[PDB]
Amino acid sequence: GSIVTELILNADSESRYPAPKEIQVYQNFVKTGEQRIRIAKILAENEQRIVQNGSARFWERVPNTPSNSGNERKTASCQRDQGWYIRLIAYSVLAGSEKPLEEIGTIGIKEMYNNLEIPLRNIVECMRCLKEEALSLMSEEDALEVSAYFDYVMRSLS
């Protein structure tokens, strides 16, 4: 879903047309479209930079972790996940909501990682590392939106 979907489904539940408030939200949202796309492009072209620089800070911060146990596959797996969370965050920025991130990445996160036997706090940590890298690649304003999505993932992991 997206901000647009949320507005529509709201009206749907009251069996009516969009209200003045729902229309204004929509107009303010689409007005920020070009900027949103600029941000998502940043993330796209800097996936490897963010992941590798963040992995690097992360592992220094946390040496006891299953991606740093001299196990490739495990290391590869964790690096892949970081890339996926970037992709999801980028989708969320475009969508104007954490819905994309929620549906694809957040709902079930504790159950999956718990099953895989990966400590949750370590994932939170790595998210901080990834968060920093990405913020640095972008303006002050651009950083606001993106920050909250990274925060969201970290919220759901605790």
Partner: peptide, 28 residues
Amino acid sequence: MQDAITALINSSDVQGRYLDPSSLDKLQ
């Protein structure tokens, strides 16, 4: 439900890819 954006996101997500040059701008 799916919207113009959700749709493009979902077509990207099933191939594990970021939105492509044509998916972007269709968005624009």
